[PDB]
Amino acid sequence: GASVKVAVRVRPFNSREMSRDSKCIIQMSGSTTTIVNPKQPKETPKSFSFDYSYWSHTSPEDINYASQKQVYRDIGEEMLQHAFEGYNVCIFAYGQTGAGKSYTMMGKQEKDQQGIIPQLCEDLFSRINDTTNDNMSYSVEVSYMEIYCERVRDLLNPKNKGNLRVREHPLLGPYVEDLSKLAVTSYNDIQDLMDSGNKARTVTSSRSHAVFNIIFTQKRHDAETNITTEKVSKISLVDLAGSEANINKSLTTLGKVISALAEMFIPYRDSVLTWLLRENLGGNSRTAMVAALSPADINYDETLSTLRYADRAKQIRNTVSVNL
Amino acid sequence: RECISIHVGQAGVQIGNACWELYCLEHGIQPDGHVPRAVFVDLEPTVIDEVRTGTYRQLFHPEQLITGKEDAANNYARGHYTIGKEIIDLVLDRIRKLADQCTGLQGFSVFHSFGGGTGSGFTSLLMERLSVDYGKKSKLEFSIYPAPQVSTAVVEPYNSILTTHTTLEHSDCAFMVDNEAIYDICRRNLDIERPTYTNLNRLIGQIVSSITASLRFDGALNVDLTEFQTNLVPYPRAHFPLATYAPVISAEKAYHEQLSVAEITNACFEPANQMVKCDPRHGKYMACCLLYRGDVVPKDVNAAIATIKTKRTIQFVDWCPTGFKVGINYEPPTVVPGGDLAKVQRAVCMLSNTTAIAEAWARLDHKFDLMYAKRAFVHWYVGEGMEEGEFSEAREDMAALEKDYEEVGVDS
Amino acid sequence: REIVHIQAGQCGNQIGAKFWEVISDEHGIDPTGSYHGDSDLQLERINVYYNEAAGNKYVPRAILVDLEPGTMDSVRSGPFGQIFRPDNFVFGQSGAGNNWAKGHYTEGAELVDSVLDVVRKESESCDCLQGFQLTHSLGGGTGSGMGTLLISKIREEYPDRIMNTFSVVPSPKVSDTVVEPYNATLSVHQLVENTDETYCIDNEALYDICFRTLKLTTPTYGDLNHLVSATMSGVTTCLRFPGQLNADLRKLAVNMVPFPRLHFFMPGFAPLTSRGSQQYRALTVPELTQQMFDAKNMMAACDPRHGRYLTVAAVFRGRMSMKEVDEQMLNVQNKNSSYFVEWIPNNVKTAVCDIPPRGLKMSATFIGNSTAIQELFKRISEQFTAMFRRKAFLHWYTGEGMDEMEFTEAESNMNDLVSEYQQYQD
Numbered sequence A: 001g002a003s004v005k006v007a008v009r010v011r012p013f014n015s016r017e018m019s020r021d022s023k024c025i026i027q028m029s030g031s032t033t034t035i036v037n038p039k040q041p042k043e044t045p046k047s048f049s050f051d052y053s054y055w056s057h058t059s060p061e062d063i064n065y066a067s068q069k070q071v072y073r074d075i076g077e078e079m080l081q082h083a084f085e086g087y088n089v090c091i092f093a094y095g096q097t098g099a100g101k102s103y104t105m106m107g108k109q110e111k112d113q114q115g116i117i118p119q120l121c122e123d124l125f126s127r128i129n130d131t132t133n134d135n136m137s138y139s140v141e142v143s144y145m146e147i148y149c150e151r152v153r154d155l156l157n158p159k160n161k162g163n164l165r166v167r168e169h170p171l172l173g174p175y176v177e178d179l180s181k182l183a184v185t186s187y188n189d190i191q192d193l194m195d196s197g198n199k200a201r202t203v204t205s206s207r208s209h210a211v212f213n214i215i216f217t218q219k220r221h222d223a224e225t226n227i228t229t230e231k232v233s234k235i236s237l238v239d240l241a242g243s244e245a246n247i248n249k250s251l252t253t254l255g256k257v258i259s260a261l262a263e264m265f266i267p268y269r270d271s272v273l274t275w276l277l278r279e280n281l282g283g284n285s286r287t288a289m290v291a292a293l294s295p296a297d298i299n300y301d302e303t304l305s306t307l308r309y310a311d312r313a314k315q316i317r318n319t320v321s322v323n324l
Numbered sequence B: 001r002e003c004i005s006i007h008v009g010q011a012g013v014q015i016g017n018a019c020w021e022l023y024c025l026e027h028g029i030q031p032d033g034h035v036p037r038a039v040f041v042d043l044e045p046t047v048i049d050e051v052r053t054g055t056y057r058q059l060f061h062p063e064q065l066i067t068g069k070e071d072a073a074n075n076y077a078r079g080h081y082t083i084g085k086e087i088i089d090l091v092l093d094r095i096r097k098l099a100d101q102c103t104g105l106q107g108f109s110v111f112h113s114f115g116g117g118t119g120s121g122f123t124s125l126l127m128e129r130l131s132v133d134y135g136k137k138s139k140l141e142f143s144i145y146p147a148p149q150v151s152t153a154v155v156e157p158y159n160s161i162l163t164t165h166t167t168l169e170h171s172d173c174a175f176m177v178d179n180e181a182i183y184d185i186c187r188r189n190l191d192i193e194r195p196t197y198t199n200l201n202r203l204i205g206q207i208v209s210s211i212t213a214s215l216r217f218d219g220a221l222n223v224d225l226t227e228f229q230t231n232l233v234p235y236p237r238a239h240f241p242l243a244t245y246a247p248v249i250s251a252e253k254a255y256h257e258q259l260s261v262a263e264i265t266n267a268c269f270e271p272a273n274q275m276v277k278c279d280p281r282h283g284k285y286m287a288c289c290l291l292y293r294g295d296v297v298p299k300d301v302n303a304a305i306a307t308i309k310t311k312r313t314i315q316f317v318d319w320c321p322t323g324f325k326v327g328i329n330y331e332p333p334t335v336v337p338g339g340d341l342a343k344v345q346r347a348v349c350m351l352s353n354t355t356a357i358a359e360a361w362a363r364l365d366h367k368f369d370l371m372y373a374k375r376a377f378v379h380w381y382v383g384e385g386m387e388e389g390e391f392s393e394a395r396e397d398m399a400a401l402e403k404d405y406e407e408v409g410v411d412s
Numbered sequence C: 001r002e003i004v005h006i007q008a009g010q011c012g013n014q015i016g017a018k019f020w021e022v023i024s025d026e027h028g029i030d031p032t033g034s035y036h037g038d039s040d041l042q043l044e045r046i047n048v049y050y051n052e053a054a055g056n057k058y059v060p061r062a063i064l065v066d067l068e069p070g071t072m073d074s075v076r077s078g079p080f081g082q083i084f085r086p087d088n089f090v091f092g093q094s095g096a097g098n099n100w101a102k103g104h105y106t107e108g109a110e111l112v113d114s115v116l117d118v119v120r121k122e123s124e125s126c127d128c129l130q131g132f133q134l135t136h137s138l139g140g141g142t143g144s145g146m147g148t149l150l151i152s153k154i155r156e157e158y159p160d161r162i163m164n165t166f167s168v169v170p171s172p173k174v175s176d177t178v179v180e181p182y183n184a185t186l187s188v189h190q191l192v193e194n195t196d197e198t199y200c201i202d203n204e205a206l207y208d209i210c211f212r213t214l215k216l217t218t219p220t221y222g223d224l225n226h227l228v229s230a231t232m233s234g235v236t237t238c239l240r241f242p243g244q245l246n247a248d249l250r251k252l253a254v255n256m257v258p259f260p261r262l263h264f265f266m267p268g269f270a271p272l273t274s275r276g277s278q279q280y281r282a283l284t285v286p287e288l289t290q291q292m293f294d295a296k297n298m299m300a301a302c303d304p305r306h307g308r309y310l311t312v313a314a315v316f317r318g319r320m321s322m323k324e325v326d327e328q329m330l331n332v333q334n335k336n337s338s339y340f341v342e343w344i345p346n347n348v349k350t351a352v353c354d355i356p357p358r359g360l361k362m363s364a365t366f367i368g369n370s371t372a373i374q375e376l377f378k379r380i381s382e383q384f385t386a387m388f389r390r391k392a393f394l395h396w397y398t399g400e401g402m403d404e405m406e407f408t409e410a411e412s413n414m415n416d417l418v419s420e421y422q423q424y425q426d
């Protein structure tokens, strides 16, 4: 029994917003985020409470600013530790187009702005390499895919122009048939794959989803008999397309799955995204949602919609057990 | 001086062919005479084709008949965004090509059917693109909003909560004629359980003739289009008055025809004669534009109305002393040669804003939720360039239309 | 607009002959002849199903897919059989084995490319394509397997155009085959995930409806087929006619599918009276809704009375009052509020053409999306397990290059499909 962790993050104004002289309608204090409706200024502002509240509207010179490193060391390290404990984990970024989902998950591979995914990978390998018990050995395999109009593309295998089939293994759940799963032995190798994968994405409103998966295997060697008990945790880091057809089936279905789970049949199979993430939503997985928010008055409805779906997500609870 | 018209959606086109018929009929311009002054839009060819195959075939220019051979789709999204988009330019072009040719116009009488694909969506952006290209004019859209219980499309509300929110901030005055509440009139005030769509059309085709046609026509008390919106909307919300006609008597059955003013005017406020299932269940009128036509003595009116102003059970808003725009025309109505309309020598096409629609909107909004509450046919729009935004954010929209139509009344 | 029929398998094929037998007459197209059309309206929209070459030869734009020569060689050697351009015949002289696996992975998989080839020659015909009609039976090889593939490919080539599927789901009481649930469960699987409108017909729901609603004592197949083909004509072709309120595949689709599964319907025709006597003409309209909405008269096996509806589409086609139509529908929606689901204020989708079925005065096709069809996939799904458990005639599948996880997959999928559908019955 573990509830879905939910964080909200508000970014700086973008060019569109500055050009319309947008005012900031988002306020944050502690774990409370309040949104002002520019349309009805005298109506009571709506407040929401979340596990994490990242005020990233200003800049690093600000004392209360939430940087990439701070967002990661917070929710990121939390989930990585769960993976070390043997739990499957998932972190997905959700929000309006341009709200800051990719910046939070991937960031920029330059000076100081790496997002959750690169940092977690670096942290994962750093920890593995600091192991001092020779009875422990590890394996790290990675997969990276894109879901566009219900079709799946293998980002680590651009040579291939066929969309992979999402299937249901009779006993082990959903999987992408013939999706590349590469073993990596260093942060540098996994980062090259990440960079290669990011470049083959399409290709400026995204309407594809990106799923970066890591299969982290921990092998404990028992000295006396020679059996090696395995510990496997799947780490799924998701960067969703923004919210505003076959192009939007996945996002709408996710909304319904999230609402249904919060309400407690579920249309998991109604879309490739919810099908593949079935166990992370209501299964054996420690899951977190990072809701990206625009700070601008002009996006009140979209932002309010995001806050509401993030509020429901908070109510989801999943039965978790360590994979030993 | 003039007023272009854009009949959008099969319906808006059927009604169009009708209103367009009544016209020449009372202007002595047979099949092939002058030249219309409107356009026809639809994403289903076969319907506009009916104007290309059937009657009033050569009275139009294949230029004011826009079609998108593609697909209609009983869904807003597709018609507004995705498909409907492709045509709009072209559409506009005519309402910019037809808007130029004229001489100091006044606006565009738009004809659409709220709960459709080409009618809800498309227009949404048509009126949308107008409010910007000619903000300096009148945008009176004549709608046929969702039958209170006898709707057709399964989604209807999705399509009508969406045409309202997108057009709201663009129309001047939106006239409303309820498809079902018109049937009643065909059952109760004309007697016929055989009402073909071709009839309801003859009816609006009448009430409408009283708006533009005759009004833009000289008389003893002329009323310009602007006049309406001015004397008819108390507030910027593209406020929607209701259309009503008086001598809706049968040209066969009963015959008391000679029903002096004093009668035909009282016959407007009885709820069973208003082309809208918005029975004045409480809705306080806040402005009525009594358009009369035919042989009418101004005193007869400035008396028949006086009697009304003091019936009280007809309670008018507070903040409104007098809300009675008396429009008098000369030429009596003009009934189809042999349809089923009586044919009197005077009529009253009274339209008005009534706190009543507080209902009609309510009952139509609720609908929406029920389905949205389960996303029902949502995947049909999303996959058509829309989002959880446009729905949820157009719901909130009307919400303040339920409060608006509530505040502007019920309170003093 | 347009569409391109697809005669997968023998059944789907046999029916092709009946669907085209009809439709043609409902469009005045003699064997190879042209448009003798009693009227002039049965031509302005034909395109939807034909092509212009000669000037008297409007050839049906369908596909005839089958791994058993004799079949197509019975359809091509009989009546209207000589109207299809030979190019249409995509045969597979191989052994059309009754195995879903033999017509979907091993034998059919070859003949596929030589099909898609044509399905493209026909799609790229002209004007604008709407979707494809698909006929077949989910109880055989060339039907469930190979036809279920034809679509999985079609839906990758034009995820835009629609896909109506006319499936002859395995009748209950008696199965005209043995592995039936195998060939079935496996094809429904493919359906729930490609086509977006399926009209399930039951050879025994027909008999009944054909032996008691038509005192018909010797209901040959030709008949059943004929009755079915009667409904699929009311659906498509029909709406491609004028009407006070007309719709078209999409409207039908965009008003009938609340949730993406694709959902399957159950078609019902209107005037279904025995020849001589019965010719009661009680067809004012309340008589048609009386008909259409009763239990019996639903080409499906299950009975509506056994589960709410999500959507309904009375696609009428004969001059009537948009009042006596729009009205009736209502009382109907209130007399049976019980079963009609509530979260949809107006389940019913009234549609109204003008011209009726050639020789009739007034008809109305019914396309119901009721939750009742839950109690059918249940059936099928049951039969599977009861026999899967023992891997009954499984060697005929695996031995054809199949998987023990493939069968698992389908059942589950289609089995879950049962689940969901209940999520609304409640």
Ligand SMILES: CC(=O)O[C@H]1C(=O)[C@@]2(C)[C@H]([C@H](OC(=O)c3ccccc3)[C@]3(O)C[C@H](OC(=O)[C@H](O)[C@@H](NC(=O)c4ccccc4)c4ccccc4)C(C)=C1C3(C)C)[C@]1(OC(C)=O)CO[C@@H]1C[C@@H]2O
Pocket (backbone or CB within 6 Å): C021, C022, C023, C025, C026, C214, C223, C224, C226, C227, C229, C230, C231, C233, C234, C271, C272, C273, C274, C275, C276, C279, C356, C357, C358, C359, C360
């Ligand atoms: C003298 C007269 O009025 O005869 C009628 C007749 O007696 C009845 C009984 C017809 C007759 O139909 C059947 O007996 C029947 C046989 C097998 C399967 C199904 C039905 C009829 O054969 C069928 C025929 O239907 C049509 O003409 C429609 O256009 C129909 N056509 C075909 O099905 C068709 C048949 C053969 C060759 C080509 C087409 C149609 C319906 C929907 C969509 C498209 C076309 C009609 C009115 C009659 C006869 C001739 C006796 C009925 O059926 C239809 C589909 O109309 C059966 O109940 C109705 C009521 C009709 O009154």
Ligand SMILES: Nc1nc2c(ncn2[C@@H]2O[C@H](COP(=O)(O)OP(=O)(O)OP(=O)(O)O)[C@@H](O)[C@H]2O)c(=O)[nH]1
Pocket (backbone or CB within 6 Å): B008, B009, B010, B011, B012, B014, B015, B043, B044, B072, B073, B074, B075, B079, B113, B115, B116, B117, B118, B119, B120, B144, B146, B147, B151, B152, B153, B179, B197, B198, B200, B201, C244, C245, C246
């Ligand atoms: N009064 C009147 N109402 C009509 C007429 N035709 C349709 N309607 C009504 O308008 C609505 C139907 O809209 P549709 O015909 O489905 O669609 P459309 O608005 O033409 O556009 P599409 O959905 O893209 O086809 C229903 O509520 C009908 O009751 C008509 O001729 N007269």
Ligand SMILES: Nc1ncnc2c1ncn2[C@@H]1O[C@H](COP(=O)(O)OP(=O)(O)NP(=O)(O)O)[C@@H](O)[C@H]1O
Pocket (backbone or CB within 6 Å): A010, A011, A012, A014, A056, A096, A097, A098, A099, A100, A101, A102, A103, A104, A204, A205, A206, A240, A241, A242, A243, A292
């Ligand atoms: N915390 C932040 N600090 C600085 N810049 C940010 C921050 N968050 C987002 N941005 C920038 O704002 C834009 C939103 O970026 P991303 O590109 O992150 O959006 P999404 O990923 O929100 N967009 P979309 O994929 O189209 O649906 C980019 O230009 C980012 O670099």
Ligand SMILES: Nc1nc2c(ncn2[C@@H]2O[C@H](COP(=O)(O)OP(=O)(O)O)[C@@H](O)[C@H]2O)c(=O)[nH]1
Pocket (backbone or CB within 6 Å): C008, C009, C010, C011, C012, C014, C015, C096, C097, C098, C137, C139, C140, C141, C142, C143, C144, C168, C170, C171, C175, C176, C177, C203, C221, C222, C224, C225
């Ligand atoms: N209605 C109907 N059903 C048929 C016809 N032919 C076969 N069927 C049904 O189809 C099933 C058998 O599949 P079949 O068509 O022989 O498969 P295939 O030929 O190998 O693709 C049985 O349930 C039959 O009742 C037909 O002409 N009409």
Ligand SMILES: [Mg+2]
Pocket (backbone or CB within 6 Å): A101, A102, A103, A206, A239, A240
């Ligand atoms: Mg992004």
Ligand SMILES: [Mg+2]
Pocket (backbone or CB within 6 Å): B009, B010, B011, B042, B044, B047, B072, B118
């Ligand atoms: Mg239309």
